[PDB]
Amino acid sequence: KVFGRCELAAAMKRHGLDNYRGYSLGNWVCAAKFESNFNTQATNRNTDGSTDYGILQINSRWWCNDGRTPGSRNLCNIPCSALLSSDITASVNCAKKIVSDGNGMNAWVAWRNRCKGTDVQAWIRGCRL
Ligand code: NA
Ligand SMILES: [Rh+]
Ligand SMILES: [Rh+]
Ligand SMILES: [Rh+]
Ligand SMILES: [Rh+]
Ligand SMILES: [Rh+]
Ligand SMILES: [Rh+]
Ligand SMILES: [Rh+]
């Protein structure tokens, strides 16, 4: 599913992401925009052989099992396929573990490079929340 901006903001807010570990909703929407272009089905293979899955491009080396990432952990205890669903519940639950892990939203390279220190409120402007 390719989400609209406000449709995703709404779904993320419902699932507890607005100010989760102090990160405003706009941060989470900006990160999804630059990680996945709001496409739940996005996958991207990494040079290390790991793959990034779903709306927030969650990595198979640490977070999910895809059965082809040697020496990988599955810290969110889910198949990576679960992260591609039109239902974002699994991606959100795993994002909460990732953002709690010590580097906060710097875990998302597109967030650090394209959202961090920007007017992220602009990503939720004109949305009914
Ligand atoms: Na894994
Ligand atoms: Rh939902
Ligand atoms: Rh919950
Ligand atoms: Rh766009
Ligand atoms: Rh949750
Ligand atoms: Rh850790
Ligand atoms: Rh870690
Ligand atoms: Rh509200």
Q: Is 112 helix (H, G, I), strand (E, B) or coil?
A: helix
Return the ∠ at Cα 108 (arms to 59 and 69), rounded to 5°.
15
The structural domains of the chain, ordered by start, are 1-129 (1.10.530.10)
Q: Does the annotation list 101 as a binding residue?
A: yes
Report the catalytic residues: 35, 52
Q: Indicate the burial class of 64 (C-beta count within 10 angstroms; 0-12, 13-18, 19 or more).
A: buried
**Which residues does residue 52 pair with via DSSP β-bridges, in sequence order?**
44, 59
Q: Name which of 92, 125, 111, 126 is nearest 34 in CA terms.
A: 111
Ligand 4 center to residue 37 CA distance, Å? 7
Task: Give, in order, the Cα–Cα distances in Å from 31 to each of 65, 73, 114.
Answer: 22, 23, 8
Q: How far apart are CA 76 and CA 95, in angstroms?
A: 9
SS (HEC) of 19-74 = CECCECHHHHHHHHHHHHCCECCCEEECCCCCEEECCCCEECCCCCECCCCCCCCC
Nearest bound ligand to the CA of residue 34: 4
Return the ∠ at Cα 79 (arms to 91 and 86), rounded to 5°.
40
Q: Name which of 31, 25, 27 is nearest 10 in CA terms.
A: 25
CB of 103 closer than 8 Å to CB of 19:
no
